[PDB]
Amino acid sequence: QPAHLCFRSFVEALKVDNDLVEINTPIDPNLEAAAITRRVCETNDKAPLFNNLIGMKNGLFRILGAPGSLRKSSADRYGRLARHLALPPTASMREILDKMLSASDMPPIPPTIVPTGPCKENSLDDSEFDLTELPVPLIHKSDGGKYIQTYGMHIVQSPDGTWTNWSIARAMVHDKNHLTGLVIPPQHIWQIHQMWKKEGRSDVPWALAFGVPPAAIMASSMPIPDGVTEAGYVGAMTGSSLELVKCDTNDLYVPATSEIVLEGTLSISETGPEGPFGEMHGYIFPGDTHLGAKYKVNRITYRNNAIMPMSSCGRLTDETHTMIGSLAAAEIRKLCQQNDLPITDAFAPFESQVTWVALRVDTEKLRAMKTTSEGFRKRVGDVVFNHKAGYTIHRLVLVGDDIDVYEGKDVLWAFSTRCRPGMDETLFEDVRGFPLIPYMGHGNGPAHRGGKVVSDALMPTEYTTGRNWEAADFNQSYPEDLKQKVLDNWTKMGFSHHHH
Amino acid sequence: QPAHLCFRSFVEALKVDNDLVEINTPIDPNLEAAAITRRVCETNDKAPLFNNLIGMKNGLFRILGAPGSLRKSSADRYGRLARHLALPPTASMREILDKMLSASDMPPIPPTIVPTGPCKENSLDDSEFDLTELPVPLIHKSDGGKYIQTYGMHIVQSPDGTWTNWSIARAMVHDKNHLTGLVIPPQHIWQIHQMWKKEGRSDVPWALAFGVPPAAIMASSMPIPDGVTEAGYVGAMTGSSLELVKCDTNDLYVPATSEIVLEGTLSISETGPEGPFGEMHGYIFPGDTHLGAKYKVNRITYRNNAIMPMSSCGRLTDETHTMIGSLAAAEIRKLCQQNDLPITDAFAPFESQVTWVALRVDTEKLRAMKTTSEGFRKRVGDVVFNHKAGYTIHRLVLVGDDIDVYEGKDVLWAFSTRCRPGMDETLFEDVRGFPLIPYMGHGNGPAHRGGKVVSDALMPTEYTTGRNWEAADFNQSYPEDLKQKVLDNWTKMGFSHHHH
Ligand SMILES: Cc1cc2c3c(c1C)C(C)(C)CC=[N+]3c1c([nH]c(=O)[nH]c1=O)N2C[C@H](O)[C@H](O)[C@H](O)COP(=O)(O)O
Numbered sequence A, B: 001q002p003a004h005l006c007f008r009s010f011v012e013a014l015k016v017d018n019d020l021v022e023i024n025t026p027i028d029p030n031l032e033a034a035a036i037t038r039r040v041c042e043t044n045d046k047a048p049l050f051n052n053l054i055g056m057k058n059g060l061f062r063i064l065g066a067p068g069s070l071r072k073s074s075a076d077r078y079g080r081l082a083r084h085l086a087l088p089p090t091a092s093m094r095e096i097l098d099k100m101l102s103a104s105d106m107p108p109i110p111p112t113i114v115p116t117g118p119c120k121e122n123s124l125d126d127s128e129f130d131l132t133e134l135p136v137p138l139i140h141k142s143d144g145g146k147y148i149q150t151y152g153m154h155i156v157q158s159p160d161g162t163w164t165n166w167s168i169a170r171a172m173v174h175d176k177n178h179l180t181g182l183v184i185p186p187q188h189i190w191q192i193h194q195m196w197k198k199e200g201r202s203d204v205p206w207a208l209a210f211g212v213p214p215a216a217i218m219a220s221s222m223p224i225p226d227g228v229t230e231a232g233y234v235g236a237m238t239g240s241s242l243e244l245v246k247c248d249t250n251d252l253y254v255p256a257t258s259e260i261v262l263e264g265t266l267s268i269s270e271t272g273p274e275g276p277f278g279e280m281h282g283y284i285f286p287g288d289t290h291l292g293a294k295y296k297v298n299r300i301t302y303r304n305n306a307i308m309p310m311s312s313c314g315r316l317t318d319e320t321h322t323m324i325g326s327l328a329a330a331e332i333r334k335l336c337q338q339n340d341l342p343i344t345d346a347f348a349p350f351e352s353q354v355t356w357v358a359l360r361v362d363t364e365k366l367r368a369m370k371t372t373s374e375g376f377r378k379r380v381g382d383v384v385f386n387h388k389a390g391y392t393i394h395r396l397v398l399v400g401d402d403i404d405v406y407e408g409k410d411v412l413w414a415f416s417t418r419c420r421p422g423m424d425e426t427l428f429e430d431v432r433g434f435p436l437i438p439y440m441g442h443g444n445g446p447a448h449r450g451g452k453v454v455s456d457a458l459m460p461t462e463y464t465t466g467r468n469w470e471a472a473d474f475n476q477s478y479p480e481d482l483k484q485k486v487l488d489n490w491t492k493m494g495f496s497h498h499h500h
């Protein structure tokens, strides 16, 4: 099976890429696996595969850390993401995001049901497993539980059967047969949970599949539209129908090659302690436990020599940055274009802790609009901050065509030099806020409302007659022939490789 | 003479440090010298010494580019600045700024007058020189003149004789015997010019000395207080009285080892076209010429084989960042402390294009103040933005004790995650603004007023009971013994030098 369609093949691909370190000596899931992975993520090192996890039994489980994190070299910086999607390992972020958006104006390719797959190689009924006995990691020293679920896909379906959602949401072990996790608005797992609660008749049928097809975990992390079944979007994106197998205890369908599957129910009535957790913005607030959603696990199925992927998330750079931020930015780009806004590109700078999105404007189109900063900022902010794709993002930075939004240094330059504080900004207090940002949920104002801004880093003539400056840089401040002379004589004179 | 006391010795020091490239083949001052220097500054390469400048004659002049720019290695990143001050080349920014502040609670050490020095080796009277015939550089292709003055020190004295100011302000060749340049409020050259204009009797006696003692050019770039003679501050800082020689045509005194000295007058009445110039924020606005101050040159004296220092300023990183920003931040730190504010450290992040200053707060002291964000931001902003040391700075970011303000990544993390847009900020519209920032002088509002902000990145409990989080990072999320184990086993497991 190809790497983008099968997690076990993905792991092979990382090895072949010389992007994997296999650790075959015993490693403790209590902090050690996650500490190694954290260091990987902070240094852009090779992904760790923990083949000898203390507490591994019944063949459950090995751990792969840092599945979607960055590589050290510039040339293949996003290679691990490219391997989720069948792209060359040198693919740019623009190419990765374009691939993730490609299915948005394609017919879905619905999944294909097959009778069995690797995920059925082993099973444990409700008399045979205990979640508290598995080698579930403690990821950060102050976490309120062992977070089994950091890179699996929750599967829930609307009561009417017409929408099956795949998404990542954290979850931790509660007891032998339950998890607790975050199920919050406006996320699709929450939206579907609310449909079942209003019906009021039963708990939500649920499955959680770990080690799914890489292209599927990417869509799981992207805010594709309400009512759109991720499986068909992934089928369109990859050009192939995904192969799914029915759960044993319910009628949901999971990827045939899933490493590990939990089957059970998400309660419409019960809750339990959840958190705290060391989160995407870089913090944990020890002791901040709150009631979360409660999942009951009835069955486990798994591959021989099952591998659990893990995100050791926090400060830069991990899956919460590379995937949450970039994939939200991609959806925002599309949203803007569909609302007739002249946006060419979007990206969530890592320097902003993925709380900003920079929007590159086609300023020729802007000029034809014959508008102003105040009007245009309001328009952009209303479109984005009133939509679910904008949920995680608190600052939008508008930039002109000279800025490469995928380069944080250039975004920070433009923000700092082209957007006058206050005057060139519009604050939004009556929009949904992201409570996980510390200044929201642990800040001075309402956790769930406001705190958003549109920062206009377009200069005045960009709305009227065109750019009226040149950069004071090597590229723009010197003629072509001179630049080339300097470059050609560089090492000859005494001054100091792409791949590396 | 020591390197910090003599520019010619400084150049030797750079050579000895393997931080200099001598270019002995012909180089054009029309753009080529500056293009090479620009590339140096964008790549943190060795400083270029142009020993064979096209148009060099009467022994005027060689060029040293990038005198105060960064070195590539982390260990000696600020080494060129350390060489201005007799510090080890590994000195930290905190140590450099502490050295520059050290004279602020010392008695001045006034200069010593000597009868002659190297700067008198050669002279040209007003029948013998033509500024338009010298190898003055065109620094950026769109500049409105040849900017002779990018790293010399203007010397003017109050009419009463009691304050002699040394400062850097740009100037370009106007004609054979005049320059034009920026003389703007609240700068000391402007303040002294205004004193002479109110007296109304004569033009201001002036000298411009290039290739001055490095410790003197650093003080020249720092906003030490009104009425304080830089020469005595530099004497206190270095522990030695500076040796000065009288000008030939006026009674001002210049450093004995200055490379090149211009003597003449700054007009109290005349102006001439000045600019545009590719400036510290990274831009030039072609064609934006405005009237500037006009200097008349009566005499030139110079060393044998004179060397003119040059800043090829613009996008990161050059003297306008390393010196303007850092030295303003140092003075702001002191100002805050003198106003009883609990500030330990200050720095202007390069990522902000040195338009921000991050202020590290002693949060124990803050807690004892029993104050709030709104009150404290207003206090800090009133102190800083009402003072000349705050002139260039448009955003202040308050951070707690866990943040190293000298590390831009950590400042950006704290800003993005701890300061709620709008609510945690205070805008200042009734303060002096810095017109050179593009969003000011080429923006949507008044060029000279407002556009400033205090951004509070202190979290709520930092004002009350203390920090209530831990970072989700390797350092803070794992116990000591574990961290050390991981580090000790790092390369053994398969994962990847200080000086480099
Ligand atoms: C990549 C990724 C996405 C996480 C995520 C993580 C990762 C690794 C974790 C597990 C390490 C930490 C927590 N995360 C949550 C999360 N969304 C959410 O609602 N709760 C979560 O607890 N997300 C983001 C969520 O996957 C995206 O917002 C999707 O758009 C949700 O899909 P949906 O649009 O179908 O609702």
Ligand SMILES: Cc1cc2c3c(c1C)C(C)(C)CC=[N+]3c1c([nH]c(=O)[nH]c1=O)N2C[C@H](O)[C@H](O)[C@H](O)COP(=O)(O)O
Pocket: B149, B150, B151, B165, B166, B167, B168, B169, B170, B171, B182, B183, B184, B186, B187, B188, B189, B220, B221, B222, B223, B224, B311, B313, B319, B320, B323, B324
């Ligand atoms: C290091 C440095 C400082 C420049 C400077 C440059 C450099 C290299 C240039 C020459 C490349 C570009 C322009 N600069 C000007 C400038 N200040 C000013 O008033 N006009 C200028 O044109 N400054 C900043 C000025 O030196 C500091 O604000 C001082 O505090 C001024 O001294 P004062 O406090 O005695 O007035």
Ligand SMILES: O=C(O)/C(F)=C/c1ccccc1
Pocket: A170, A182, A277, A278, A279, A280, A281, A313, A320, A324, A392, A436
């Ligand atoms: O648990 C977290 O660190 C996390 F990022 C949650 C989240 C992300 C995006 C949307 C919603 C919740």
Ligand SMILES: O=C(O)/C(F)=C/c1ccccc1
Pocket: B170, B182, B277, B278, B279, B280, B281, B313, B320, B324, B392, B436
């Ligand atoms: O010419 C310039 O690029 C410049 F930075 C001028 C300046 C700097 C600080 C204070 C005043 C003017």
Ligand SMILES: [K+]
Pocket: A166, A167, A168, A219, A220, A221, A222, A223, A224, A230
């Ligand atoms: K999704």
Ligand SMILES: [K+]
Pocket: A418, A419, A420, A424, A456, A457, A458, A459, A460, B439
């Ligand atoms: K603007």
Ligand SMILES: [K+]
Pocket: B166, B167, B168, B219, B220, B221, B222, B223, B224, B230
């Ligand atoms: K000065």
Ligand SMILES: [K+]
Pocket: A439, B418, B419, B420, B424, B456, B457, B458, B459, B460
């Ligand atoms: K705050």
Ligand SMILES: [Mn+2]
Pocket: A165, A166, A167, A188, A223, A224, A225, A228, A230
């Ligand atoms: Mn969805």
Ligand SMILES: [Mn+2]
Pocket: B165, B166, B167, B188, B223, B224, B225, B228, B230
């Ligand atoms: Mn001064």
